[PDB]
């Protein structure tokens, strides 16, 4: 039995940790219980082995490390220190993108997006776009529809930031391959997003 | 089993957090581990009751409630937003003063002393000094040498700030009770500071 108590955690980090724990626990076929008391998030997991619990701790560390470095950047420190913190974000986003969890891949996307928005057209912005594309490739492999909807949205940010780049070409392939998988779903909302995705690749 | 994730806290808040979890753990004789993890504190407690776990949660939530409000005080000094943060610091310090632990009481003394420093002579300082005396009274009842030393220093702070007040008379009563227990300590340094405190009680 395992329990995680999140105190003074930002909502972005909390929800990504909620989805990461719920994902890793379904892998071992275990139920998860969440409750929010006085701004404290209690995550209780039952019958979880050490291997999956250590995987929860690694993903939770990286998400909090990204949030800790984003807090320094948003404090407008020295530009030299801010650059050092953006490299910390990209380092944790790289490992978050090397994990099978959907929430970890979604965390690597949102982490690398803030680096692109912080310094557009920089060497780190290009490395951040590599992280966004690395996460979109693993996110398109996953079967869930929500993962496919984030794989297209993430790849669309690569073609928006660097149109005509080498990364944008692969991002368009990811959008096409993910939209074809979305066409398999009978739900009209999945078919709608697949058509707008196909129309975006047709427009470019 | 239980992992506490604490983010966006200073070094002083983290040190008070570690000692508080260690003290609540001895009530059940459990095992606790800490990790500093660059920007967020990780606390793992094994085989602890859910009540004790939720006592750690509310105590750590009060500590970060003080740390977050202090951050506002040190950034917009003199604003009406600072006056609101000082009332939040006192509201959390009052609840920490009711908790009968050395770390929880030290956190209430340091917090309320920060309100005395920011708003001298105001009604907030008077409410803060009452919390300092409430925590000093609980510290004197604790059977620990360092807790008795802190009760003397906290109540001596009250007589230094507003002397000849109704609170200064109550402070001298607390100083006397703590010094009477300090003289029973075999520690020579405790014997020395107990006489210095009892000498200050004869005066005023």
Residue numbers in the entry:
A (entry chain D), B (entry chain A): 1 to 204
Quote the study on this structure.
We set out to design sets of interacting protein pairs for constructing reconfigurable assemblies. Our implicit negative design principles enable the de novo design of heterodimer pairs for which the individual protomers are stable in solution and readily form their target heterodimeric complexes upon mixing, unlike previously designed assemblies.
We determined the crystal structures of two class one designs, LHD29 (2.2 Å) and LHD29A53/B53 (2.6 Å) in which both protomers are fused to DHR53. As for unfused LHD29, the interface of LHD29A53/B53 resembles the designed model; at the fusion junction and repeat protein regions, deviations are slightly larger. We used architecture-aware rigid helical fusion to generate two bivalent connector proteins from the crystal-verified fusions of LHD29 and LD101 that allow assembly of a perfectly closed C4-symmetric hetero-oligomeric two-component ring.
